[PDB]
Each structure stands twice: as C-alpha cells, then as structure tokens.
Design a binder for this molecule. Structure first.
Ligand SMILES: [Mg+2]
Ligand SMILES: [Mg+2]
Lengths: 776, 135, 120, 68, 64
C-alpha cells in the first residue's frame, strides 16, 4: 500500500453561502479544536462581503473608471468594467448589469447585490481531502508533498437515490437477528422490542426498473493540482420531459494537491408546486441536492511513476448532509462512536478497558446540551450535580476510582438508561412482551382510557430513539450504546484508570475539557484525527432515520476495514483512534448494482439475506454512489422540521430528538444583548437599558436581570417563519415541514460568544448564542 | 384564540388578554424547584438531593433558583391541546377544538409564598400556574 | 381461492401492522378494548334477550345483538342498531380501517344449544 | 350449481373463557406470525381456533368508515 | 425582488389594417410554491395573466 486518501468518509454540508474559501467553513480535522472559540462566524458577515468586494477592486479598476469618468452609462460601457471584477461566479452577470443601470456609487451598488444574495447566508461546510504516503503495513506518515513535475488528479462521482429508494418507517435492523454489537443489544431483536416494519417504494407510480433509473440524480468530475479552477457536480432530475438541474456539489484542487469538496446550495423542490412535503421522510415528486459517493485519485510523479488510489482500502467516500446549526455542540453519541461500537461484540464487552477519558465525553457532551435543549439546562439532575461540583472546584472527585468515591460515581451512573433495555419493565407472559414501567411517549392517536401510572423514574438522556413508534417499548427512549454504557459501568464500579496530570486539570469540567482538547491538538496522527473529526460532529442515534446518516453505519458489514490503532495520547485514550474504510463497489456509477432494489417492498428478511457476502443481496453493503444517503428523508428539510420535540402528557422534561445539530431551545441574540455588558460599561445603552437606569439600580438587581435574560430560551422552530407568524396563522407540525424547504436557511445558527465581565451574575464567560434575522 | 399573535420579529410577543387568559406562566414544577432555601432540612431541596443542594456554593444555589423562576411556559401547553404525542399536529385549530374539553385542565394562576428568597432575586410573593400536567 | 404465484413472485407483499389504540399498554389493560356479552333463551319462553356489553370493558353501553327462541325451538339472532362512536367527539374516523378511540357494535361468537326431551 | 357442502369453523370450546381470548403477537403482526400459525402445535396456532370476536376483528373500526 | 415575466397578450396588424389581439398562455402562479389558492376568489401571493385595457389608433392617409 502506497498512498491513501483521508478522511475515509468526508462530510460536506449544504449552505446558501458561496463555495469560496474565505466565505466557507471546513469540516473539523481535529476533534474539540474550537469548542470555546468566540470569534467563529458560521453565517456570512457584512465585513466578509466588504473585504471580498474591496479585494475585487483595482486591479487597475479604480482608475480604469476615472478613465470613463471624463468620457461622459451604456452596455459594454459596463461589461468592460465587470470582468475586471471577477464576480460573475457569485452573482448572475445580468443582475450586476441591472445594478449599475439605476445610477463609490459603484461599490455600494454592488455590495447590495452581494448582501441580498449572501448576507447572513448559512456558510457551506466543505471537506478537505488529503493524500498521505504510507508504510510497510500501510500506516500514514506524512501528507503527500508535490515537487516540481508531480501531479495529483482527483475523481469524484456522486448520486442521490432518495427518490428511487424505499419509505423510512423505522430501522430495519431492529428485527435483525444478532449476537449483539457495541452499538445495539441482542435484546431489541430477541425480545421484539421495536419490530422492523415493511416499507413500500417511494414514487410508486414510476414502474419498471428502467424508468425508475430517472429518479436517480448523479454527476461526476475531476480536478488536478495543475489547475485550481472549481468544477461543478451537476445532475438532472428526472435524469436522462421537463428537467431540473441539481448542483450536487463542487470540487477544487489546489497547488499542494488538497481536494476541497463543497456540498450543494440546499435547494429542494417538487416537480409540481402543489406537491407538498407533508411527511417527515417520504414525499413523492420531490428531489433534493443531497448526495454521496466515491473519491479516488491518481498520483503522477516526475519520474513517470504512477500510483492509483482506487482500491477500497485506500479510496474514500463523501456524503453531504443538512447544515450543522450548533457546530460547537457535539452529539452525545457520534457517528465515530458508531464506527467504534461496530467492531465490538456485545458478549466481549466484559474485556473492555476503561479510562476516565473514555467516560468524560458522555458527561461533557450532555452538560453542553444545555445550550440547545431545555431539559439539559433546567431538568437534568446530572448537569446540575456537575454544576454543584464546579461551584466548589470539586469536579476531580469524579476522577477518583477509590471506594470513598464509589457512591458518588454510582449515583450518576444509575441515572443513565441501560442499552440492554431490560430495566424498568414488567413482563407479560414470562409470547413475552417487555412493557416499560417508566414514562412512555404516546402516539398522537389518543385513547380516552386511563394511562397506567409509571412506577420507575425516567432515565437519561431524555431523547427519543429507534422504537418511538411503539408506546410502552423501552426503545422509545435513547440509551448510550452498549460499549459506552460498559465504559460508564466500569467507571461507577471503580475499574478505570486515569493519570495524575488529568486529576490536576479537573477542578471544573471546562478545565478538563480544555485539557483534553489540547491532547487532541498535540496528537501527532493527523490522518487518523482527520478521519475522526469528519465524523465526531455527526449524530449516532437515534435513527428514525437520523440527521446525516442512518443505521447501516452501525454495522461492521458496511466497512471493508475497521481497526483500533492507538490511544489519542500514549497515556490518554479519549475513546481511541481507528483506521476504517467503507465497503465500496469499485465500478462506482457504472456498477451493475447501481439501480438494484428488492421489489415492491424492503423488509428485514432482505437485510438478513445480505449478511452473507456471497449472497445475491450483499450488494446492499457494497456501496455505490448514493447508497449512504438514499435512506434519509426526501427532502431533508421536512425531516429536519420533524427532528425536534416530542411532547408528553407530562410537561417536563421535554423530549428532544437531535438537538446538538438541530437545536430545540436556544439562547437568542436578543437575550445576549441584554446580559452581555457589565454595569460599568461605557455605553449609552447597557443590556437594553438606558445608561442611567442600568446604573441607577442595585448591583444585585443588575446581576439578577442579566441572569433572567440569560435564562429565556426560545423554540428553535420560532427563529424563522415556519407558518406560525401572523393573525390566525395555523402554525403546527405540518406547516413546519412545508415551510422548512424555504426557511431552513433562515433558522438560528448557534455560535460561541464572550461575556467579558460576568461578575457574580452566574453567567459563564463563554455562552452559545443563536443568531437569526428574526431573533435579534 | 385569545393568546399570542406572533410577528416576524420574535420579541416582544404580542398577547391578547393575558391577565385573564394567560399566555406565559410560571408552572408549579418550577415553583417546586425554587421555593426552598439551601437551609431546608429535607431529603429533596428544590428538586435536588439534600447532598447536592447543600454541597454547592450559596452563590450557585441562588442562581439555580432564579434560573428556574425565569422558565415560563406557554399556557396552551399546560394541558393536551392537540400537540401531545409522536407526530402530533398541534397548531391553532386543534387548540380551538380541544379547548372544549380541556378548558377545565388549563393552568390556574395563584399567589404562593417564598419563605426565604435570600439574595436570589425572587420576590416573597410569586404567582404560580397549577395544572395536572405541569406539576 | 389463491394462486401460489402471488407469494412466489412477491406480487403484493404482506405488510407489517401495528396495534390499534397503541397507547393502551399491557395485555391486562388492553382487555378493556374488547366488548363481550352473552345470553340464553329457551323454547319455554319467547322473551327476547339483549346481548349488551360495555366499552371500555370492565363508559358506554353497546348493544351487540338480541336473541329469541319461539315455541318450536328455532333461534332468531338480531344484530345491533349500527351505532358507532368515539370516546371523545373530537376523535374523527379519518382512516378507512384503523381509527383509535372508536368502538362499533359489530360482533361474532359461539352458538351452542342443549336439547332436553320429555323422557329426561 | 357449484354444489352443497358440510362445513364447520374451528372453535375454542371454552369461548369467552378461553385462555387465548386475549392473545396477540406483540407490537406488530406480520406474515411470519401467520407462517408459524400453520403448525397446529405452535404458540401461534390459536389464530385459527376462533374465540368470540375473532372473525370480525380484522375489519375496519368503525365499519362505516370502511364502507364509505 | 425576485420578479416574474407575465405575458398579458400579443398584437398583430395585417396589411389591411386589422388588429388581432391574442390573450396570454393561461399561466397563473404564486411567488412561493407553498402558497396554495384555496379560496374561490381571494388568494394572496398569486398573479395571473388576465388583463384589460385601452385600444386606440391613428389613421394616416397618403395626403398627409
Ligand atoms: Mg452540533
Ligand atoms: Mg385576571
């Protein structure tokens, strides 16, 4: 093995921001790098547009105008004075012409067209792909360094098959017979806790395989280190009748051979305006610009030597996804956790070794959910106990594995839901059905019969899960997966290790999080950190179907390789670094299995048949472009609008699906501007009050008002107009799904911001604030 | 129908007749998470174990009290008005329909005492919304 | 009545089906969803006997049918009045088959008899 | 004229008091449950030995919606 | 603002001086796809290509 691409699965997220480096973001290449970065800008800013426009200026432009100034505006009057400003690739050229017909007056006239298109736009999160030279074992050592005459050529082929694939009712693997993995317990299938449902086809009126091929969008392209021009990945729907161009993404390669992959613009649409997307997942007549596919490369060196990066051990994949609306807020269980769990078998979790750095991510991610979900701000007894420990600089007690601390550790561990799903149940027919004795999540279809009172407390976290469709099933609610619950159980029991250096940096959770963040940033294995960073920000449950990807990812059958390599640091595991690659069909878009299905429906029996890699059905795991994302909701916007709260008859805690990436309760900018400042601030308005009123008040009173404002959390669905605005607006669930198609790009984006002098108010120095146009 | 009328601007939220048909209330559940002083000799203090509540700094204890005091609930969410359950539609019209049966389960606001607010900023008299859902 | 081709060539695959009234959990509580009644009549008395149950079972009275026996020993079974109703007026039956919170007076069951001649 | 036949339904002679009066298959019913029901010694064979309510339980509730 | 072209009609004149007026193609549309026209007469955010207006002419004979 000679050269290898990293990451093995790249991720790019859609946004209406432009596909240019200064105005875009990059998928994390190091976990936890930017958790407290209060200068982050995930929306396009006025400053950014001003600079890009100033940098488009002269160029000789500023006196090729003066040239024109004394010569008097007509047509090539202005077409000359375009071009000099290379802005055609950001704004359609005529709108630029419309701009100058109605007249430093040129700067303002073109800044307003840029602002109309891009101001406050959701920036695209692009993925950098790197080539690494390997070893005698194939271990990455260093990024490829091109010398004179060396050339890298990348190839990308992607597709979207959502409109071609099957309905998503629930995860088919919930009925798949197994011995159990690190991600999913044998009990779910064995005891029928959440049976897999059959699924009919999407767009069922398109019949015969050959006509259904039109439902698949696909495109490809190539770029080289000899030319940094961007190449669009453009397909058509219906594919080859009136047709729509679908920008699935864009690719760039720079001087040093790095591939930058931009996702699409976030455009979803029906073939007829009256076909509304009223279902969370399955909407006929719709297409979106999500895609996924195969990334390969060829390295040509000065010496004629040529190396092909196309095998599945050194090739890569790319998938595009909905935006991340809280990029610094990490899912409690990530897709990288699924990769790690997929390589473990449930019965060998006895042999698992636990450090405190394997347990800390669970507690840290949960603690930070307070910024996106109300229940974790004010209804989570573990987050409150962590606050109690921080108050007295006593968080380090949790790192104590001795007997004097067992009851402290156990008290926290016992609040977590056990992924065996065999606790808090009563059995009928010990034919056995496991019926939860804790709080159930009812169906909307009500029955006026007295609910059975819950005898068992609700465990953590307070999120729905794969079995939501079945009231009374333990799998209605989310559990950290078996291998992570084992880590926590080892922690509680005292069978864990930790270093003294860690203890000394563990007086508060934030201090230790900053310490562990530094361990990532100084870990020398950049190829494997980049593989992990691309996935540590993606959700890993529940899957109904999820946010970015769904349940095939939690099975080892989807990987051609999945190996433990190393701790993040020699002495600190932090859940580990792994070499993993996806199973790939090496023919890509030209695979004979590109357009395969299972007939009128898909069912778990089809998945059962696919386990055997020699079977006819094994193509299910050997991914062709489009295969990773076809399971998800079409369009993704209606799935996002459905990925929010699920209310119970009991008001609190409010269950939330995926709040780390699609927040539910946020802290608006409006509130930030009412607790930002201290009473001493040299400002005519302080926290929304006149200087005189703000300083005429007691200090206690001033600080109390800060905290009240800080305490006001806003439903994320209300950060834009999702059908609830206006006199007699209907609001409600279904209007949210319809309106999200246009309003996704106006939803609030959560961003770390400073509080420079919190005083005694109780407000942390770093807060996470939701910016939108309506909540300012 | 006598509740909030939302504008494109988030704040302030317009309300019709909130003095008699409240729009945002302070639930019982929150009241039980701020009415106790750290001094209380109970196994549960403001929704926390005795050990946790007394182990934190007094500063922190009072801040948690005021955070709870500041959580206001949509009055229409104080009983099941069509928004409860997996894939519940919710929305304006289901509120009109369900109120026929649910008016009698809507939260009722009543003055309640806070014996020792200390330095929390909570007034000695609060007005708390009682309903079966929000308790 | 049905060709093997339907199953063999997967012409119309059977679909999984969830429970009606799924918020009623545990078999014991789900017994409340079943409406039942019984009765007996004789040749010696022509009086009609109603078959009346309750929903939810042990609230609304549900007349599932009526039975009679004339002096010649022939049984006459009348069905219900065609009354269907939700437990709450706002629960509307918008699905062709599966509407939670609804009962009707349809039924079916077991018909037995015993003959008793004069010679004992 | 298509003939005359003697036929009888399978019945549970305990009727309302049968121990299978209230049996089901858990959270869903599927064809695998009907496959197992063919074996007369299975835990599922009760599907074919009718107790009161067993013939009409499949039909629409209420019947009026199914008729429309 | 994102604007739509609306063909309200077409006009021809032949060599005999006859004006021929064609109406539009029948295209109606909302400014947003989700704005549905559920009222018989009053639907906000819609436009159609119906029109009406004024017809005038000028006759110019050989003798000026
Ligand atoms: Mg996030
Ligand atoms: Mg009043």
């Amino acid at each position: 093995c000679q050269y290898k691409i990293y990451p093995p699965l790249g991720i790019a997220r859609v946004g209406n921001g432009p596909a240019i480096k200064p105005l875009s973001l990059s998928t994390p290449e190091v976990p936890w790098a930017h958790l407290y970065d209060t200068n982050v800008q995930y929306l396009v800013t006025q400053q950014e547009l001003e600079q890009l426009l100033e940098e488009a200026f002269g160029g000789n432009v500023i006196n090729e105008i003066s040239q024109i100034k004394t010569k008097l505006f007509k047509q090539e009057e202005i077409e000359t004075i375009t071009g000099l400003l290379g802005l055609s690739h950001l704004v359609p050229q005529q709108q630029l012409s419309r701009s100058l017909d109605n007249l430093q007056q040129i700067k303002g006239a073109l800044l307003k067209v840029l602002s109309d298109h891009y101001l406050h736009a959701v920036k695209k999160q692009a993925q950098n792909f790197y080539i690494y030279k390997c070893d005698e074992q194939g271990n990455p050592v260093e990024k490829l360094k091109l010398t004179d005459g060396d050339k890298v050529t990348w190839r990308v082929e992607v597709a979207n098959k959502k409109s071609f694939w099957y309905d998503y009712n629930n995860a088919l693997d919930l009925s798949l017979h197994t011995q159990g993995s690190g991600n999913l317990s044998k009990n779910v299938s064995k005891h029928r806790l959440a049976p897999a449902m059959t699924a009919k086809r999407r767009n069922p009126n398109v019949i015969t395989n050959s006509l259904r091929k039109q439902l698949v969008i696909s495109s490809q392209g190539s770029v080289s280190s000899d030319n940094n021009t961007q190449v669009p990945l453009r397909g058509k729907f219906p594919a080859n009748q009136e047709r729509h161009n679908v920008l699935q993404g864009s690719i760039e390669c720079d001087n040093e051979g790095v591939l930058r992959f931009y996702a699409g613009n976030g455009i979803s649409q029906a073939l007829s305006p009256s076909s509304l997307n009223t279902d969370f997942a399955d909407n006929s007549n719709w297409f979106d610009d999500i895609c996924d596919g195969r990334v390969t490369a060829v390295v040509e060196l000065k010496n004629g030597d040529t190396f092909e990066i196309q095998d599945e051990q050194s090739s890569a994949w790319v998938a595009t996804t909905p935006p991340d609306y809280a990029p610094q807020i990490e899912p409690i269980v990530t897709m990288y956790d699924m990769v790690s769990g997929a390589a473990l078998k449930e019965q060998d979790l006895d042999n698992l070794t636990t450090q405190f750095s394997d347990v800390f991510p669970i507690l840290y991610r949960l603690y930070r959910m307070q910024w996106v979900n109300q229940a974790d701000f004010t209804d989570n007894a573990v987050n409150t106990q962590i606050r109690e420990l921080n108050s007295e600089l006593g968080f380090a007690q949790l790192l104590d594995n001795s007997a004097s601390a067992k009851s402290l550790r156990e008290g926290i561990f016992n609040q977590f839901r056990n992924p065996l799903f065999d606790q808090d149940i009563d059995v009928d027919d010990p034919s056995n059905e496991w019926v939860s004795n804790s709080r159930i999540i009812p169906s909307k279809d009500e029955t006026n019969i007295a609910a059975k009172p819950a005898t068992s407390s609700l465990k953590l976290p307070f999120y729905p899960n794969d079995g939501i469709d079945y009231p009374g099933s333990p799998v209605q609610w989310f559990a950290i997966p078996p291998f992570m619950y084992q880590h926590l159980q080892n922690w509680a029991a005292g069978d864990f290790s930790v270093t003294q250096v860690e203890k000394e940096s563990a007086n508060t959770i934030e201090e230790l999080g900053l310490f562990y963040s530094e361990q990532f940033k100084n870990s020398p294995n950049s190829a494997l950190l980049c593989a992990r960073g691309a996935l540590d920000a993606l959700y890993g449950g529940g899957f109904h179907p999820g946010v970015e990807l769904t349940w095939p990812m939690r099975h080892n059958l989807i990987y051609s390789q999945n190996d433990y390599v190393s701790s993040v640091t020699p002495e600190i595991n932090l859940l580990g670094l792994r070499e993993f690659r996806l199973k790939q069909d090496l023919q890509g878009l030209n695979s004979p299995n590109m357009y395969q299905d299972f007939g009128h429906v898909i069912a778990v029996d089809n998945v059962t048949a696919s386990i055997d890699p020699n079977s006819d059905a094994a193509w299910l795991w050997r991914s062709t472009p489009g295969d990773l994302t076809k399971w998800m909701g079409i369009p993704w916007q209606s799935a996002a609008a459905s990925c929010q709260a699920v209310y119970t008859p009991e008001d609190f805690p409010i269950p939330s699906w995926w709040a780390a990436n699609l927040p539910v309760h946020v802290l608006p900018l409006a509130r930030y501007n009412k607790f930002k400042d201290s009473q001493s601030a040299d400002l005519p308005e302080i926290n929304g009050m006149t200087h005189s009123i703000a300083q005429g008040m007691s200090e206690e009173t001033f600080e109390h008002l800060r905290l009240e404002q800080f305490s006001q959390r806003l439903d994320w669905l209300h950060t834009a107009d999702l059908g609830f605005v206006g006199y007699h607006a209907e609001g409600g669930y279904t209007n949210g799904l319809i309106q999200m198609v246009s309003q996704w790009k106006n939803m609030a984006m959560v961003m770390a911001r400073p509080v420079e002098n919190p005083g005694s108010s109780g407000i942390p120095n770093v807060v996470y604030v939701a910016y939108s146009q309506a909540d300012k």
